[PDB]
Amino acid sequence: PVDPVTGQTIINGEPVVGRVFIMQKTDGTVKLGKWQAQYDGEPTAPEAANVGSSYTVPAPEHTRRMRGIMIQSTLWSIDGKRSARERRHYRPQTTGAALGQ
Amino acid sequence: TATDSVQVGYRGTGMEQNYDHGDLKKQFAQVKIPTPLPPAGESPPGPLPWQNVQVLNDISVGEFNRTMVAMSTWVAGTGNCAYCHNIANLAADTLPNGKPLYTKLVARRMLQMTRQINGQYSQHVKNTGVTCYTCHMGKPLPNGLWFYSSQTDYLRHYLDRDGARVVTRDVAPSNANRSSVKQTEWTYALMISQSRSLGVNCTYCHNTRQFASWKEAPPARVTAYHGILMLRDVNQNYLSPLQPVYPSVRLGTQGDAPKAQCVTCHNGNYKPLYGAQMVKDYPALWGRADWNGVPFQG
Amino acid sequence: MQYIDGAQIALYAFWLFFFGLIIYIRREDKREGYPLESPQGPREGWPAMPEKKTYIHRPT
C-alpha cells in the first residue's frame, strides 16, 4: 500500500523512505522443484502412435536402396547429380514369360 | 566477413541465429514486391454481370477487375489473359476446340485455397496473410513441389502422417513411449528440412537442452506447429484432389498432383518475403470480415 | 524407493571406488623421496608411507 498523502510505500503499517522495489534474483529466476512439475503449463501427454494393422510390400521402383535414416536431409537435399539420383531406388522388374521370351 | 546475429533466447544459453551479411543483403535486395494496385471503391450499386463465377461472388465489379489484374501479375504476368482465359469469351471454361482450360480451373480452386489459408489459419499468418505472389512469385510453378517417392519420405508428415514425438515424459522407461532411435533420426531429418526451409537453426524453435519443452522454447515453435496443420489441410483438400485436372507433364512419376511444403511459401526465410504485407490491400483474398479493423464491404 | 534410483546408486558406488583408487595411487606417489624433511621431524601426509618395495634383477 501507498500513503495517499506523502506518496510513500507502507510496509506492515510503517512508511519507508525511498523508492520501494520488489526484490528478485538474477533476471527473475526461480529454483526448479520436482521433475513432474516441469509439465505445469506444458501440453498434455502425446497420444498413442498410429501403427498400421497390415503391411503391403511396395514396388521395387518405390523402394530405397539406401537404408540410412537421415540420407534424404543430409545428402540428397544437397546432392543433385543425375546418375546418383537414378541409383537411389531399385529398378522395375518383370519376368521372362511376361516379356514373351 | 561480418555475421549478423539475432538473439532468440536468454543470455548465455547459446540460442542465436547467425547470418552472413553479404549474402543476406544480396538476397534481400533481389526481392521485388509488385506495387499495390490503386483502390477501386466507387462501383455502382448494380448486379454482377458475371456468367460463370462461383468464388468471387461477394465482391464488387471494379474490385473484381482489380483482383484479375493482380492475379495475372502474380501468376502469369502483367496483362496476359492467355494463360487462364481465351480472349474472345472470358466466361468460357473450355478452349475453342473443346479442351477444358485447366489453368482456369486450378486458379478457381486456388482462389478457394487462398481464402481458406487466410481465413481458417490466422494462427500462422497473423495479419500477414498470403497472396498468389507468396507462392508463385510471378511464375506459374512455385518452389518446393514434391510428389510420392517412398514410404519413409518425411514430407508425408505434411500429407497423411501424424505424430513426430519421440521423447519420454517420465524419468523411467515404460510402454507409454517405445520410440526407436531410428524414429528419432527420422524426426531429425524432418526438422533439418524445416530449419533449411526457414533459413534458421534448431534454436529458433527449441532450447536443445530439452527438445520436448514448449515453455523453454521461443513462441515460434507454436506457430510452426500450426504451419504443419495448415499444410495438412492444403495438401489434402486443395492440391491433391486436383489430380485429374493437370496434364501429365504436371504430375509426378506415380501420376499424383504436386504438393506444397514450408519452403513453398518461405523460400528459405523466417517469414515469407521477409514479412512483406500484400494481402491487406486485396480484400478478395481475405477469409475474414476485416483484416486490421478495415471492414470487408460485401 | 522413489527418490533413490539405480543411476544414483551406481554413481555413489563409482564415487567410493574412485576415492579408494585415489588413495591407492597417492600411496604409490610416496614410494620415492619420503619421509619429508621438516624441522619438526619426519612427516607423512595421508595416506601414510607404504612399505619398502624391492625389484628383481637377473643374475650375472
Added chain:
Amino acid sequence: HRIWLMFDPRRVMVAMVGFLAVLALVIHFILLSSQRYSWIENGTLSAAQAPVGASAPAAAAEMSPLPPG
C-alpha cells in the same frame, strides 16, 4: 646497391615472388568473386551494362531482412 649486402638477394627474391604471386591471386579472386568484375561470366557486357553497386538507398515498411530479437 649496398642494400644487397644487408639482405641476401636469394631470400629477398623468394619473398618478393611469393608475396607478389599471393597478391596477384588474391586480387584476381576478389575481382572474380564480385558482381561488376566477374569477367568469366559477364565479361562480354559493355561498361554501361555492367553491374553497379547501389547508391544511397531508401527505407522499407514492415519488412525486415532479420528475424526479431
Added chain:
Amino acid sequence: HRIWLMFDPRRVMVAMVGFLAVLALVIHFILLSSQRYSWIENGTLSAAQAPVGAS
C-alpha cells in the same frame, strides 16, 4: 645466363613445371565450373547462344 648460377636449374625447372601444371588445372577447372564456358556440355553452341552473366 647468370640466373642458373644463383638458382639451380633442376630445382627451378621442377618448381616451374609444378606451378604451371597446377595453374593450368585450376584455370581449366574454374572454366569448367562456370556457365558460359562449360565446354563439355555447351561447347557446340555458337558465341551468340552461349550464356552471359545477367545484367
Added chain:
Amino acid sequence: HRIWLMFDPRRVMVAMVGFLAVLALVIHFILLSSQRYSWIENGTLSAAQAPVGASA
C-alpha cells in the same frame, strides 16, 4: 642518427615493412567492407550518389 647504433637497421626495416603491409591491408579491407567506399562495386558513383550513414 644514433638511433641506428641503438637499433639494428635490419630488424627495424623488417618490422616497419611488416607493420606497414599489415596496416595497409587492414585499411583497404575495412574500406572494401564498408558501404560508402566499396569501390570495386560502387566506385563509378559520383560523390553525391555515394552512400552516407544515417543520423541514428
Added chain:
Amino acid sequence: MLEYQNLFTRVQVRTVPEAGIEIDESTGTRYGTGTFSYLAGKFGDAQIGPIYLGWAGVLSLIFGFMAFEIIGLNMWASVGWDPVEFIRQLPWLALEPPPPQYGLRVPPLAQGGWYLMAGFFLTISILLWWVRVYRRARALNMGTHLPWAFASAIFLYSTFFFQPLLVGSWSEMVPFGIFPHLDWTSAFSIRYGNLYYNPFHALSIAFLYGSAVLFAMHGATILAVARLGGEREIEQITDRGTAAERSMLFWRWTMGFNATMESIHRWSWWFAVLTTFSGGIGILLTGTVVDNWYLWGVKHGLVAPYPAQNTLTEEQQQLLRGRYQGTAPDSFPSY
C-alpha cells in the same frame, strides 16, 4: 638460436635389425626381418621390424576381414554397385541395423541380417585380438596391464550390443558408417533426453579431458628433462637420477603435490581406463533405468533455471499435444 627442443632427430644411427627376444614359436612365428624408414626415424624409431603371427592373430584377421568385406559389399550394393558413387558417397553409406518391429528375432537378409553377421564377426575378431595381446604380453614375461586396458575399451564397445538387447531390439544398434554412426550418436542423445545430463557421460568426459591433460603434462615433462636422460624411464624408476628428481620438484613447486616416475603411468593408465569404463556404465543405464536424463537431472537438482520463453493457454496445452511417432504409410492415397 633456440635451444634443442627434442622435437625431431637430425642424426640417425643405423645397425643390424633387432630380431627380437627369444620367445616360444610352437604355435606362431615372426614374419619379416626388419626394415628402416628414414621419415619414421625422424620422429621416433626407424625399424619397421618383424611382426609375430600365431593362432589368435590369424583367426582374428580372418574374422575381421570377413566383417570388413560384408560391410563394404553392403555399402557398395547400396549405391547400385557404382564405383564412382561408392567413392564419392563413401562417408554417407552405411550397413543399417534391422527394423524395430523384429525386436530380437532374426531379420531378413537385406533388412539387417548382414548387419548382425558383420557385428558378430567383428566381435569375435576383437575378442581374438584381446587373446593375442594377452599372449604377446605373457610371452615376454611382462605384466598384463595392456590386456586389461583393452578390456575396458571392449567393455564400452560391448555396451553397444548389450543396451539394445536390454531395451529389446536390434534396431537400436550403431550402424556401420562414417557419417551414419555420428547420426546415431546424435539421435541417441536426443531420444533419451540430452545425454549431457547422464552423470556417467559427464564422468567419462572428465576422464577423457584428463587423459589429454595428463599426456600433455607427462610428454612436456619428459621432453623438458630429456637432456638429462629422462626418456629412459625404466632406469629412472629402478635408479632415480636427476631427471626424475627435477620432474618431481617441478610439479611439487607448481601445484603443491607430485607423483613419481613410475606412478605417473599409474595415473595415466587409470584415467584412460576409466574413460571407457564409466562411459559403458552410462550407456548401460540408458533406456533401462533412465529414459530421460534431463528429467533425472531435474529430479536430482542438476538443471539451472532459465526464464520461461513462452506461456501456453488452456486450449493451447490441449492443442499442442502431439502424437508419438508410428509407422510409415504403406499406401499412396488418392484424394
Added chain:
Amino acid sequence: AMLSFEKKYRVRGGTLIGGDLFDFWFGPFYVGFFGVTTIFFVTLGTLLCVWGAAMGPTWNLWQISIAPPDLKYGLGLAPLREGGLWQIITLCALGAFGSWALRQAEISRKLGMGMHIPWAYGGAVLAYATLVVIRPMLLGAWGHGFPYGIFSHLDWVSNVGYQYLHFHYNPAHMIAVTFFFTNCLALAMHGSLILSVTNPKKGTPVGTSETENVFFRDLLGYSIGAIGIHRLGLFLAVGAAVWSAICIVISGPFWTKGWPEWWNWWLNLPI
C-alpha cells in the same frame, strides 16, 4: 616440508620478473612475482564467482550459473548485474592463466629443464581464449561466450552445436575428436607398457628398454621410441586443443550455414 633430495635444488635465480623479494617457497609451493599475481587474480575471480552465486536463485553447486551479457551490448562492458560480472570474471581468469604459465616458465628456468610445459599449457589457454575472446570479437559481441556454470555451460555447448544443425559434420571437429580419441588410446598403451615392464610377471626380473620395442614390434609391426612416444603424446594432446580452437572459431565467423551442407564441395568435384 621438503623431499629428501629437495634441499640442494632450492636456490636463487631463474625468475623473469622480480629478484630476491619474490624468490621464496610457501610450503611446497614456489612463489614468484607471477605466483603473487596468480593469487591476486584467483582470489578476485573466485570471490566474484561467489558473489554471482549469491545474486542467483540457488546455492546448489550444479545449478549456479554466471551468464554473459546480451548481444546488444556488443564488445562493451555491460552492467554488472546484466552480464558485466561475467566479463570481469573473464578478465580475472585470463590474468590468472597467463600468470600460471609464466610462473611455470620461471620454475622450469630454475631447475635447468626445457620450456615445454608452459607451451603445452598454452594450447589449453589458447582454446579458452578462442572461446571467450577471439570468437566473440570476430562475431562482435561478448555475449557469444559461454556461461560460468557446471551444467549451464553444457547447455551453451548443446545450443551452439545445434546452431549448425548437425555439428558432427564440422571437419575440424572430426579431426579434433580423432586427436582426442587417439590420445586416450596412446596414453593407455604407454601407461600399460611402462607398468608391465617395471611390474612384470611375478618371479621374473624387471624388463629392459629392448623389451618394450620388441613387444610393440611383435604386436603391431612397428614400435615408436621411448622419446617418440612422449613426442607423440605431446603432439596428440596439444593438437586436440589446437584443432578444437580451429573448429569452434570457424563456426559463425566463417561458416553460418548447417555443417552438412559444407560437404557440397566434395560432391561437386569435377570427376
Added chain:
Amino acid sequence: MTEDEARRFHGYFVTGTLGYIIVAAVAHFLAWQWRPWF
C-alpha cells in the same frame, strides 16, 4: 659501426621515408577529390 655509414644510412632511410609519405599524400588527395570522407 664507424658512425659515418650511420649518417649515410640515415640519409637513405630519410629520403625513402619522405618519398613514401609524399606519394601517400598524393594518393590521399586523389581519393579526396574522388570521394571526400569529411
